[PDB]
Each structure stands twice: as structure tokens, then as C-alpha cells.
Amino acid sequence: XXXXXXXXXXGXXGXXGXG
């Protein structure tokens, strides 16, 4: 938070898949 910015709410990661 509240005084700058950022958005989203966390950080990230990417993802992946599986098989």
C-alpha cells in the first residue's frame, strides 16, 4: 503493501505439466 505498487499478489512460478 500500500504505497508503491506490485499487483498480482505473490511472486510467480511458471507451471509445468505432468505426463
- CA–CA dist 6, 12 (Å, integer): 12
Half-sphere exposure of 18 (CA within 13 A, CB side): 0
The span from the CA of 8 to the CA of 10, in Å, is 6
d(CA 12, CA 9): 9
Distance of CA 4 to the CA centre of its chain: 17
